[PDB]
Amino acid sequence: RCXHXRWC
Amino acid sequence: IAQARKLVEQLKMEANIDRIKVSKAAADLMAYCEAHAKEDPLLTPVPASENPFRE
Amino acid sequence: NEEKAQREANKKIEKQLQKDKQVYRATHRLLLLGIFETKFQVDKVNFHMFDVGGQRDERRKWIQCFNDVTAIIFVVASQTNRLQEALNLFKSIWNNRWLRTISVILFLNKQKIEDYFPEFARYTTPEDAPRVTRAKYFIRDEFLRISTASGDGRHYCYPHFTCTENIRRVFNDCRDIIQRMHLRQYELL
Amino acid sequence: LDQLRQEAEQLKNQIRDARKACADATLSQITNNIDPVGRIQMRTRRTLRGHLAKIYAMHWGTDSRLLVSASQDGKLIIWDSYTTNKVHAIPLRSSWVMTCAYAPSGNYVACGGLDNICSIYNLKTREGNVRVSRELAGHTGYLSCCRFLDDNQIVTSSGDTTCALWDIETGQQTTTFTGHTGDVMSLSLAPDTRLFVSGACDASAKLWDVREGMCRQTFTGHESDINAICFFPNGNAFATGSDDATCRLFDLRADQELMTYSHDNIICGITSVSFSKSGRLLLAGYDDFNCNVWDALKADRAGVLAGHDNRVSCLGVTDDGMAVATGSWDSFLKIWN
Amino acid sequence: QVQLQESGGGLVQPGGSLRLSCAASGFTFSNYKMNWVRQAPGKGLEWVSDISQSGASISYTGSVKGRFTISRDNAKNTLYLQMNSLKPEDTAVYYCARCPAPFTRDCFDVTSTTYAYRGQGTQVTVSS
Amino acid sequence: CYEQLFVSPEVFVTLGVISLLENILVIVAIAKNKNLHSPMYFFICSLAVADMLVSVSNGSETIVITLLFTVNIDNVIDSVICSSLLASICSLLSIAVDRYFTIFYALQYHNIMTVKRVGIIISCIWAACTVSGILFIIYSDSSAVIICLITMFFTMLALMASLYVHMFLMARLHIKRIAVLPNMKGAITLTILIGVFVVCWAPFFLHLIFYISCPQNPYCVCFMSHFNLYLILIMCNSIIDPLIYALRSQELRKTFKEI
Ligand SMILES: [Ca+2]
DSSP, X not given: XXXXXXXX | OHXXXXXXXXXXXXXXXXXXXXXXXXXXXXXXXXXXXXXXXXXXXXXXXXXXXXX | OHHHHHHHHHHHHHHHHHHHHHHHHHSEEEEEEOOEEXXXXXXXXXXXXXXXXXXXXXXXXXXXXXXXXXXXXXXXXXXXXXXXXXXXXXXXHHTOSSSTTOEEEEEEEOOOOTTTOGXXXXXXXXXXXXXXXXXXXXXXXXXXXXXXXXXXXXXXXXXXXXXXXXXXXHHHHHHHHHHHHHHHHTTOO | OHHHHHHHHHHHHHHHHHHHXXXXXXXXXXXXXXXXXXXXXXXXXXXXXXXXXXEEEEEEOTTSSEEEEEEXXXXXXXXXXXXXXXXXXXXXXXXXXXXXXXXXXXXXXXXXXXXXXXXXXXXXXXXXXXXXXEEEOOOSXXXXXXXXXXXXXXXXXETTSOEEEEETTTTEEEEEEOOXXXXXEEEEEOTTSSEEEEEETTSEXXXXXXXXXEEEXXXXXXXXXXXXXXXXXXXXXXXXXXXXXXXXXXXXXXXXXXXXXXXXXXXXXXXXXXXXXXXXXXXXXXXXXXXXXXXXXXXXXXXXXXXXXXXXXXXXXXXXXXXXXXXXXXXXXXXXX | OOEEEEEXXXXXXXXXXXXXXXXXXXXXXXXXXXXXXXXXXXXXXXXEEEEOSSSOOEXXXXXXXXXXXXXXXTTTTEEEEEEOSOOGGGOEEEEEEEOSSSSOSOOXXXXXXXXXXXXXXXXXXXXX | OOSOOOOOHHHHHHHHHHHHHHHHHHHHHHHSOGGGOSHHHHHHHHHHHHHHHHHHHHHHHHHHHHHOOHHHHHHHHHHHHHHHHHHHHHHHHHHHHHHHHHHHXXXXXXXXXXXXXXXXXXXXXXXXXXXXXXXHHHTSSSSHHHHHHHHHXXXXXXXXXXXXXXXXXXXXXXXXXHTTOOOHHHHHHHXXXXXXXXXXXXXXXXHHHHHHHOSSOHHHHHHHTXXXXXXXXXXXXXXXXHHHTGGGSHHHHHHHHHO
């Protein structure tokens, strides 16, 4: 699950 | 000659006018400001209730 | 109840003032000096040129009116030494407290000088540019010396030699004034 | 010619000796004992915005509520100061307007400028639509100031060095006031409206008799051009604002200067001048973008109005003396209280 | 009251010299830029020279350049013009005019026929 | 490069507030100054609101992760961030286009760029950015969304660059004519305007390209490991934007000094 933003 | 004669006719007319002392002129200006002091709302600010601008 | 009718009237005025705001900013004002207002269109661009023919030769007060004008069109003819009188007038307008942001489109029309200007004796024609051209460009540079002295990049002088195409010159020069004004604002110039 | 110049200079010396004879004590010596006014701190209560271009002049109505203002975009807006609402907006034939006046009746408004014409606008009418009623075309120079006496009479000062009393019904000059050598920049009517003073670009102020139609007294003291002139409410004095960065108070009966309102810090000229209702305060508009409040009697500076970002062109005080309105080249009116 | 008085004119031989003085009163002399202007018989008013407030920035017309020198005293409110090697086309009434406003760079209407801050003028004649 | 660089939950909020405050004053300076009611300063005001949202939305999201239905709250904050990004890039383009019209349509400008059209354009941008943002987050798992975001950025970077270079060439053409009378400033300002945009934004869209092109390549994963560091560069942009656009005008800087 991306910690921040998206598409990490 | 036309502009020169007009200046002399004017100067000679205002040369003969009665002048009152500057002391009397000052006292009369000081007397008016003292008498009408309370009437002036810029000098002494009026309460916000009686002020037309902002309440 | 009465305050509601006053808002309605205020709304009509502000709606009209919005239409006038666009017509005012769209129109480019010009001052012509060597009482009539002229409005013309070139390439669907509105110009409003004021002539100061019906005023006295004492200019120092009514000149202040044109502190927001797009450009002043300064016309000069090439006994009393009228050329130096024109240089002095240009210098006053250029260094004026309220006109020091206004550009000047210069028009030198009608085409000895050594007697009235001793600096001409040693003057040489610019390479960028005949006793006619030596004179023409001497008088041009005489006006440009004043414009480059105190400018500070806020306003420039646009010289031209007059004798039909004069309307197009004022159009192109006004474009440059607006361009240079914005380019300086964005810090590209 | 050489003789009349010697005769002219002879009379000027006689007038100077008569003016120095009646001078014994200065206004400062009499006003040294009376207590100072203190700090007059005043704030923008209203900001009237609508004008596109710089505002050249404004004038209050006699109701002390409605005020008219003129701008160089060619519009003449009558405001409601209390509510900030616009009552009328008048498009002008000539965009270059320098003066506007509000009739004491409140029925008409006058304005003119570089067009050399004074346009009277009827605000009433049966239609309820604002239209130009009469156009006064006599002056050969730009109109600097105009002021109504009643609905049918109006005085105008122009750049052709002359003032003119008009009859609006017939639309022709009743009297011409010749004397000034420079452009006449401002007018001021006495409370009795039987006299008026005018300040011109010859650094001279002249008192005129409206009924007879000749100059009575010529006041000198300013170095440069007098831009603004205003009658002291008493009607026996007036204040003049000049380009020499000084305001001066003159007495009509003493026929000489009383006081000078100048500070070393101030080097810019005075555009506008107006008294308070009592007259104790003298407000002057400068071209450093701020207005200075002067103690008329003591000469010391009372306070400052620092609202405008551009040149302050005009400055009005209401008849009831509640407010002060400043017009500016930034295209904003500001009501101070 | 602003008052300017010119003195030092008269009849001089061609190639001769004169010194025009201008007594100023009714204003702070040091706050104002000063000018000389002449009006030749049957001609218009033409600017001659000007001098800055301090007396640093000086300018002339081409006709007078190298022959005329403008100098001002501030302790004494006087303006001078030293005229050297005069020729008959210099014959004119020389006026002493100050710029309308103090401290300002621009100088307007000094040759405007009706200008207020201009003296009575002094007569200079260059004849044989 | 198996693990991803951890940036403190506190380095996000701090750049979040320093940005937020700096952006509000820029709006107030334009709101409280009627002389700054030109079409130019409305596009700068559009960027000020866009930049303000990026900092708050990314800031607000670092607090929710620290404290903590989570999928919903999470999809809402992302939609606000994604909408804030596109609005920020569009606002930068809008300023560039506006400026281009003031030089190359100098005499026709006020007939073209009217208060009504400026209002429509800004409103139409924000509407297209919000709808775009919501749609991208719903179909985030889809590949097409990433390709569209990359194409969007590189087209708007190309145009922004092209517009400013052409404005510089016209400025250089004027300097040649002014110099003939009896250049570096233009180069420096251009390098800053384009440089700051590229250095701050490009890393994020380079990450997206490596996220599609090479998910498994060892040299790509090491780049994609610094995703937070690229998000910090995106916020750094919103902090710097006010300095290089709004505060560069004398009138707006005078109002900022007053407040
Ligand atoms: Ca997320």
